[PDB]
Design a binder for this molecule. Structure first.
Ligand SMILES: NCc1ccc(C(F)(F)F)cc1
Ligand SMILES: NCc1ccc(C(F)(F)F)cc1
Length: 330
């Protein structure tokens, strides 16, 4: 079987992407943030503290004939940005673009952090990292992808994120019409539970390519590109007036500047991120200082190939017994 669903940016900056997901019987449609950096499917629900819900669509398990409370199961998650949520667990039917999984763990949020409440367009997250990161206790639960793997025509899903435009998540097949040239596959380490790979280097604008191993994760759930300080300093050195601001919390640049492209290596192939992709607009309404889409990972402890990088490519998440990552230009 296969599944195909359109994913849409939540705002004019591509801060996140939401994808409609059907939960329960009859279907309750929620717009979820597909996150290859985490492994929990959790949603706003009728159980969420009422003061912490502000415009989100909620899942109501009492209205689903297939919902089963997972007795004694709880969950609690903390993301690298300081966000957090927690609650209890149900099993229910979950469908993504025609692809159906029965008995999927649906984690009902009882408490969510403020940043989730303030995001009215995101009804929850759908984790697509490896199941070893799932936070359900005392019995760990499998991701949507892991549960669907056996019935998929091919044990893969692909991410085709758009720049200020809708995109597509596909399950079970590779759309050979969606990319140009060839797909370059690179090895994945699952030892931390992430889609972790090694980039072969980078280049700034039309500059010389620098062969150097950059170990990072493919994370659709992270907005920006987080790379080592040496690389990020080399990039912003090519933007007149750019500087790292402690009060803002990253590199900023004059909004009148034109940004150079950024290239990163995948084996012998190259993925070029257009400079316009790195512009994330004024730091505040009316400001002439703009926030950069490439930031340092020094404070994070791991390099993150977020949406800024991934939306420049057609990305294959190959969940075979030996998992790999595929990158193609588009
Ligand atoms: N998108 C989920 C996510 C968020 C943060 C991290 C970090 F910070 F641990 F790298 C990994 C995955
Ligand atoms: N990396 C997972 C993640 C996704 C979205 C959010 C937000 F936008 F709701 F804060 C936080 C964390």
């Amino acid at each position: 079987s296969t599944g195909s669903a359109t994913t849409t940016p939540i705002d004019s900056l591509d801060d996140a992407y939401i994808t409609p997901v059907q939960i329960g019987t009859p279907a309750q449609t929620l717009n979820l943030d597909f996150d290859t950096g985490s492994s929990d499917l959790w949603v706003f629900s009728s159980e969420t503290t009422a003061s912490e819900v502000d415009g989100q669509t909620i899942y109501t398990p009492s209205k689903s004939t297939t919902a089963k409370l997972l007795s004694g199961a709880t969950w609690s998650i903390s993301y690298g940005d300081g966000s957090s949520s927690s609650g209890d667990v149900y099993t229910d039917t979950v469908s993504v673009g025609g692809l159906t999984v029965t008995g999927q763990a649906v984690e009902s949020a009882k408490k969510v952090s403020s940043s989730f409440t303030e995001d009215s367009t995101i009804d929850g997250l759908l984790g697509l990292a490896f199941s070893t990161l799932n936070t359900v206790s005392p019995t760990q639960q499998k991701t949507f992808f892991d549960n669907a793997k056996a019935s998929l025509d091919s044990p893969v899903f692909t991410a085709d994120l758009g720049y200020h435009a809708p995109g597509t998540y596909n399950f079970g097949f590779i759309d050979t019409t969606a990319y140009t040239g060839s797909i370059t596959y690179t090895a994945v380490s699952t030892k931390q539970g992430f889609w972790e790979w090694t980039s072969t280097g980078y280049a700034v604008g039309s500059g010389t390519f620098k062969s150097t191993s950059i170990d990072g994760i493919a994370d659709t759930g992270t907005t920006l590109l987080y790379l080592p300080a040496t690389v990020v300093s080399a990039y912003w050195a090519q933007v007149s007036g750019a500087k790292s601001s402690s009060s803002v919390g990253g590199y900023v640049f004059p909004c009148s500047a034109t940004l150079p492209s950024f290239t990163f290596g995948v084996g012998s192939a190259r993925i070029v991120i257009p400079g316009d992709y790195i512009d994330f607009g004024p730091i505040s309404t009316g400001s002439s200082s703009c926030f950069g889409g490439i930031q340092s990972s020094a404070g994070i402890g791991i390099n993150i190939f977020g949406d800024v990088a991934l939306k420049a490519a057609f990305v294959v998440f190959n969940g075979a017994t030996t998992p790999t990552l595929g990158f193609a230009s588009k």
